[PDB]
Amino acid sequence: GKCRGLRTARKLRSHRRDQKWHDKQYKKAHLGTALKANPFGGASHAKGIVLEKVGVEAKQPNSAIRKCVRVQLIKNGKKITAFVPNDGCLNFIEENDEVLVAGFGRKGHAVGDIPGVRFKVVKVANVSLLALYKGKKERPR
Amino acid sequence: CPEWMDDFEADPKGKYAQNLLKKLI
Amino acid sequence: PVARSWVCRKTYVTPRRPFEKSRLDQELKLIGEYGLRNKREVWRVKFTLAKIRKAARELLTLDEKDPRRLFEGNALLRRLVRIGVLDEGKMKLDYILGLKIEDFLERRLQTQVFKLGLAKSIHHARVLIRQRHIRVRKQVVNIPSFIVRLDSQKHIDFSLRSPYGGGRPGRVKRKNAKKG
Amino acid sequence: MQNDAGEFVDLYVPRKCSASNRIIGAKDHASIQMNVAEVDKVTGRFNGQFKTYAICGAIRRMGESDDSILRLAKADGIVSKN
Amino acid sequence: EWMPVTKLGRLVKDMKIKSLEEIYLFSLPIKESEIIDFFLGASLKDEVLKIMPVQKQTRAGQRTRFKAFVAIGDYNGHVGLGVKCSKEVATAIRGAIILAKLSIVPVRRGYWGNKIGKPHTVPCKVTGRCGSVLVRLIPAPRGTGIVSAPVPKKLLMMAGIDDCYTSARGCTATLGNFAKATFDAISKTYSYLTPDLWKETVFTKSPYQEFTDHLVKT
RNA sequence: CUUUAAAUCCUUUAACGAGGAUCCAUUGGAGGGCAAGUCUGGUGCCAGCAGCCGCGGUAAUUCCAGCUCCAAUAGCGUAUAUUAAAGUUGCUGCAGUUAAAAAGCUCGUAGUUGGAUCU
Ligand SMILES: [Mg+2]
Ligand SMILES: [Mg+2]
Ligand SMILES: [Mg+2]
Ligand SMILES: [Mg+2]
Ligand SMILES: [Mg+2]
Ligand SMILES: [Mg+2]
Ligand SMILES: [Mg+2]
Ligand SMILES: [Mg+2]
Ligand SMILES: [Mg+2]
Ligand SMILES: [Mg+2]
Ligand SMILES: [Mg+2]
Ligand SMILES: [Mg+2]
Ligand SMILES: [Mg+2]
Ligand SMILES: [Mg+2]
Ligand SMILES: [Mg+2]
């Protein structure tokens, strides 16, 4: 059982922080290795240069080709695979063009079918992908 | 609806089971 | 450094469960019955009632002879009686916990304008207020969410600069009279 | 049971076990309400009224119902001393 | 037309027992749903909480049955819960309604603070348990409503509680255990020995003693 | 006019100013979680959707659209940090037979705790 005496505050506090270090989320947030290894560097979004268009096999129970792009982040040069969400949207992207990339939705964890992919393209050449998809804006020339 | 009970009882575990159960309650 | 103030509040809170049949139906009933624009007005009234209930609950746990309890309980009861939500014969603290949202919704200028017969519907009442046809005492009031004080209720008129009260025809009457 | 006004706001008042003073619940079917016919002091005959005891299911399950009823009858004078 | 089989049914039909609380007083088992229909037929409502398909593996395939959970109760003082499993959903619902009627227990209601008006909340903090699910009801101030999950909220509103605080622990995802636990907590409200019930009980006559002759000749 | 250092805005007042009152509300959804269509056309494990479970292999309630519907509404989606949910850090208040877990065993300093009793 736990100590319960009136003079046990230091024991309780020290035990709580030591055991707190055994929590996955707490250790991830406070250890500093996760932030160092994060390609975004703790940012919500990032900007990168499209290196090549790639097709990724969907996971086994469902068969499909997910259209992604290899991007090189400007701020640190790290290379990333980012998912281009809607259909035909890969045709809006060219080679060696500016792209704004965001997270995929689960804090650096792969989402759904696409394996080892945790980023999605938000902007292509400073115009939103949604606007291009819905015909609100056209690709700048 | 009795049709809901029938469509659920035909396939208790199927593509439409959850919707029909939600309708039943 | 500037000479500005930054005190501000949120007047409503949002429900934790976004989609549930009972809450949605009850809110829609209130909106339709009192001619409200959206659910934010319902949540605003709910928030004021919740703050009042929280204050009353804080006061109840105090001692009956505690001067703070006496002081702020008297103030709260007098504020609630003054706007017409509470009855003077029910001026005990616990009765505050018996108040409902409809009591606060009935004291709006929109519902009172409808009840006094100045308008033939709650929506007609809202458009009458927003169109500067309604005055309270001598001040033309433009805000539907104007909680009418109990003493101020007897002075709600048609705003004698308006066509319905002051007999000056508006744009449409003037234009249609020029066509003759 | 009583509010400030003074009337009894309660659906019903349940019986308590005469042995353990526990409340006998609405759905507790091991409980019993025994009636014992006391006898007149001259003719040794049943005279019409009686003394009633109530025991909950727990006491009966523990096997202590017999001793409890024995003591309740002893305190009532139904059972002679020793 | 109802033809009673049990002694209690005959007494109830023959206009001898005037209230369900007389049956609750002597903890008599109720085995005929027509008794509940006779006493609270007008005010009773039902609500199918869940339909769950259960499967039994067999040499050729899975035999599937359907389990219905039904909560019943007039929204003043009474509530019941019933679970029935059958080969057809409609039969399961009918049986669950019958069982819920057979399981109607009285609910004791108290006050949070001042005892002004009708009782509105639970008399005290109560707890129900059913297979790793623990449900705790806490008295709440007037006008607070029911602060609970939807499944216990249905039963609490159906019983007649206006205001209640709730805390639940365990695997509440199992609707059956959650419902049975909140039902157990509700049922415990009249088994708590509060000081107002310290007065020594005055024993009355059971219906089987009051109407022995009428039962003899009927 | 008023405002103001001078103005602007707001307030006050002339004149004009509404029937598709075109003086035209959007952003997200419609299998479950979770409110709202196993309606119609196209595609056919492709394109794609899908936070999770899953949907799509020729009769798709899930994709691409039309219609309809619903949530909030001058706002509403998305990414990330954080809080509640989390009694999943547990002081309140968690666990350690078999689900993760009691040191192989004993001694022992510090620490923590420590039986009545006095008007
Ligand atoms: Mg919990
Ligand atoms: Mg679970
Ligand atoms: Mg739309
Ligand atoms: Mg669609
Ligand atoms: Mg959904
Ligand atoms: Mg639904
Ligand atoms: Mg999404
Ligand atoms: Mg869907
Ligand atoms: Mg947290
Ligand atoms: Mg908590
Ligand atoms: Mg645990
Ligand atoms: Mg182990
Ligand atoms: Mg050992
Ligand atoms: Mg030591
Ligand atoms: Mg001592």
Q: What distance in Å separates the CA atoms of residue E213 and residue C139, rounded to the nearest whole number?
A: 82
Q: What distance in Å separates the CA atoms of residue D51 and residue D39, rounded to the nearest whole number?
A: 11
The total domain count for chain C is 1
Give the resolution to one decimal, in Å.
2.6
Give me the residue label for tokens 């209230």.
Answer: E19
Cβ distance E48 to B25 under 8 Å? yes
DSSP alpha helix (H) spans, chain E = 7-13, 20-25, 33-40, 89-102, 150-159, 175-187, 207-210, 212-216
In sequence order, the 6+-apart residues with CB closer than 8 A to the CB of C132 are C140, C142, C159, C162
Look at strands E164-169 and E146-147 and give their pairing. parallel
The answer to whether the Cβ–Cβ distance between E53 and B12 falls below 8 Å is: yes
E143 touches chain D (CB under 8 A): no
Q: What is the DSSP string of chain D?
A: -B-SSS-B--S----B-TTT-PBPPTT-TT-EEEEE--B-TTT--B-S--EEEEE-HHHHHTT-HHHHHHHHHHHTTSSPP-
In sequence order, the 6+-apart residues with CB closer than 8 A to the CB of D50 are D35, D36, D37, D38
DSSP alpha helix (H) spans, A2-139 = 9-20, 24-31, 33-37, 129-133
Would you state the structure tokens that stand for residue C102, as one six-digit string?
Answer: 């409809």
Q: What distance in Å separates the CA atoms of residue E4 and residue E14, rounded to the nearest whole number?
A: 10
Which method was it determined by?
cryo-EM
Would you state the structure tokens that stand for residue A27, as one six-digit string?
Answer: 């250790």
Q: Which domains does chain E have, with CATH numbers?
A: 1-106 (3.30.160.20), 107-200 (3.30.230.10)
Task: Give the nearest nucleotide to A66, CA to C1'.
Answer: F48
Query: Packing angle between helix C67-82 and helix C39-60, nearest 10 degrees?
Result: 150
Q: What distance in Å separates the CA atoms of residue E13 and residue E203, rounded to the nearest whole number?
A: 25
Query: Packing angle between helix B2-10 and helix B17-24, nearest 10 degrees?
Result: 150
How many Cβ atoms from other residues are within 10 Å of residue E108's Cβ? Answer: 25
| Touching status, chains A and C (3+ beta-carbon pairs under 8 Å) | no
Tell me: domain D1-82, CATH 3.40.640.10, correct?
no
Q: What ligand is nearest to the CA atom of residue E167?
A: 1
CA distances from A85 to A68, A139, D47 (A): 9, 17, 94
Q: What residue ranges do the domains of chain A occupy?
A: 1-141
Residues in chain E with CB shorter than 8 Å from the CB of C57 are 141
Cβ distance A81 to A68 under 8 Å? yes
Instruction: State phi, psi for C23 to the nearest 5 degrees.
Output: -65, -45
Amino acid sitting at position E145: G
Q: Which residues pair with A106 in a beta bridge?
A: A109
C23 located within any domain: yes
Which residue range(s) make up the domain with C111?
A: 18-180
Rg (CA), chain D: 16
Taking the centre of ligand 15 as the mean of its atom positions, its distance from the CA of residue A6, in whole angstroms, is 15
Look at strands C156-157 and C135-136 and give their pairing. antiparallel
The dihedral region occupied by E182, where left means phi > 0, alpha psi between -120 and 50, and beta the remainder, is alpha
Rg (CA), chain A: 21
CA distances from E206 to D21, E25, E27, E170 (A): 20, 9, 10, 42
Instruction: State phi, psi for A73 to the nearest 5 degrees.
Output: -65, 140
Would you state the structure tokens that stand for residue C36, as one six-digit string?
Answer: 């409200």
Amino acid sitting at position D66: D
**DSSP state at residue E69:** E
C10 located within any domain: no
Cβ distance D24 to D15 under 8 Å? yes
